[PDB]
């Protein structure tokens, strides 16, 4: 109540302290929710009204640190205090529109605070939007894929996870009510076939073909159950051709092998009748990864062993 009353006063606090007050009010919401069954209700309004008046105002052009503070307060509070499109379908759409306005591709700036915070909040908390995550997807993937080429040493790595959880939480729903979606399924499938065959000039559409292939190998098995069997054969050929024919001496692409192994493993858990000629190449693969442990980074060294 002390730090909550200290923003219910008249003018003070030159915003690099109001940043920290908004951060403490959310981190306190994360740890130990025994007392705020009641008071954490109004803290939602205290975040949203301020983020509204900082977002939409034709005069008094917006403030930069207080956006970062209010967003990181919400991305600490939204654990254990969800309001999703199942039980309260208003504030969910409100926060969704607010983060969508917060992640638009500004170009003539440096100021990577609102991109980073909005991307991280969507990344960790992607699962709360269960009807408004499935209808803007070409624009969504285009702006996210724009920011996966953002050329920032801490924001490319912070945006890739957002892309990941976006794909993960759209997959579970397109598999859910099958055969009467029947167009979104076809759209992602016909954008995924051959996009691993892309003779690419980067490393990223490569990896996202890998990841979406290994993830959407699931929902083809309720409908087709033969493209899933063409899958992993196409996949293990298109991954064995990447390194076990050429230049294991000279290459620097050791950084996509966890994506490799997770993709092959997640289709291999759904497969049947593994063709018995490729498993002597799967077993050169995973021992190459067991060898390729000390040229890794911490943080990556844990999902690798996963």
């Amino acid at each position: 109540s002390k730090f909550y009353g200290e923003l219910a006063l008249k003018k003070k606090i030159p915003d690099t302290v109001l940043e920290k007050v908004y951060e403490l009010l959310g981190l306190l919401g994360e740890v130990h929710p025994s007392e705020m069954i009641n008071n954490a209700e109004n803290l939602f309004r205290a975040f949203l009204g301020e983020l509204k008046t900082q977002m939409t105002s034709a005069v008094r052009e917006p403030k930069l640190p207080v956006l970062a503070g209010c967003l990181k307060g919400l991305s600490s509070l939204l654990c254990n205090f969800t309001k999703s499109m199942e039980e309260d379908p208003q504030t969910s759409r409100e926060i969704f529109n607010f983060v969508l306005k917060a992640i638009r591709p500004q170009i003539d700036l440096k100021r990577y605070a609102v991109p980073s915070a909005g991307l991280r909040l969507f990344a960790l908390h992607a699962s709360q939007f269960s009807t408004c995550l499935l209808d803007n997807y070409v624009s969504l993937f285009e702006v996210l894929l724009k920011w996966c080429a953002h050329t920032n040493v801490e924001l490319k790595k912070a945006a890739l996870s957002a892309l990941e959880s976006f794909l993960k939480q759209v997959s579970n729903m397109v598999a859910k009510n099958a055969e009467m979606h029947k167009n979104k399924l076809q759209y992602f499938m016909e954008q995924f076939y051959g996009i691993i065959r892309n003779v690419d000039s980067n490393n990223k559409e490569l990896s996202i073909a890998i990841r979406g292939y290994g993830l959407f190998a699931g929902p083809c098995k309720v409908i087709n159950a033969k493209d899933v069997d063409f899958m992993y054969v196409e996949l293990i050929q298109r991954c064995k051709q990447m390194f076990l024919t050429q230049t294991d001496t000279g290459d620097d692409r050791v950084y996509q092998m966890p994506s490799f192994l997770q993709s092959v493993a997640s289709v291999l858990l759904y497969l049947d009748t593994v063709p018995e000629v490729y498993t002597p190449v799967l077993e050169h693969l995973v021992v190459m990864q067991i060898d390729s442990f000390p040229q890794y980074s911490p943080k990556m060294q844990l999902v690798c062993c996963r």
Binding site: L7, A8, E50, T53
Partner: peptide
């Protein structure tokens, strides 16, 4: 004192 008491903010 909004006919309930409490405490307010700039937005209400």
């Amino acid at each position: 004192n909004t006919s309930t008491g409490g405490l307010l903010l700039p937005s209400d």
